[PDB]
Amino acid sequence: AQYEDGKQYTTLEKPVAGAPQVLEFFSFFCPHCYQFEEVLHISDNVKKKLPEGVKMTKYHVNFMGGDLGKDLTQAWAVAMALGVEDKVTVPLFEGVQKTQTIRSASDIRDVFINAGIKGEEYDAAWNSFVVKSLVAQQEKAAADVQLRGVPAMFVNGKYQLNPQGMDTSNMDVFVQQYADTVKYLSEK
Numbered sequence: 001a002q003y004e005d006g007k008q009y010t011t012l013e014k015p016v017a018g019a020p021q022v023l024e025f026f027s028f029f030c031p032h033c034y035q036f037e038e039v040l041h042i043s044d045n046v047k048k049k050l051p052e053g054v055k056m057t058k059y060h061v062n063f064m065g066g067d068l069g070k071d072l073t074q075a076w077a078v079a080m081a082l083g084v085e086d087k088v089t090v091p092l093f094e095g096v097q098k099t100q101t102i103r104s105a106s107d108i109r110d111v112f113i114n115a116g117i118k119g120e121e122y123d124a125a126w127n128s129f130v131v132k133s134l135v136a137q138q139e140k141a142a143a144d145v146q147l148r149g150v151p152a153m154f155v156n157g158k159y160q161l162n163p164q165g166m167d168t169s170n171m172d173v174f175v176q177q178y179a180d181t182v183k184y185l186s187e188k
């Protein structure tokens, strides 16, 4: 068949009931995730191919970057709570992996200030239990599929994208094969 288990995707042996339809996991410390966001715009291109009524969820992980990696999961919870993912994703990637200007939780906070989130508003969110709950949701979802690597993407808690079974001689063709696979899986 054109799409085959083990080629463009793998099937979870333990399916996760009631999981988000399209669930992406990343880390601001992960070099491939930097490419997935800034060079390939994977999330945007998947979203532009997805059927109607299919929601996309994207979560940060703790297992890279020790203390700061856990700060970044909480900061991503702040980004989701305030709805400013599109404003902070690039400066967070570049601050961690390009310019090496993110070394502390305060440096993370500076990205949000510079992106226009008020200081009192960032701090209220950071300390809020709504943000604690969002952190817990990110952890639970990763635990549900015993996640040990990023980037990763899961469709209906059943299928996991397999990018290494795709051709990368052309970056645009790769992106569209990846997105078409997500669409194919969402339609299973």
Ligand SMILES: Cc1cc(Oc2ccc(CC(=O)O)cc2)ccc1C#N
Pocket: 032, 035, 036, 039, 149, 150, 151, 163, 164, 168, 171, 174
């Ligand atoms: C075109 C392209 C394709 C890639 O394919 C992969 C390979 C492995 C993983 C998971 C992991 O091992 O971290 C994720 C995507 C990666 C980077 C770029 C760029 N520019």
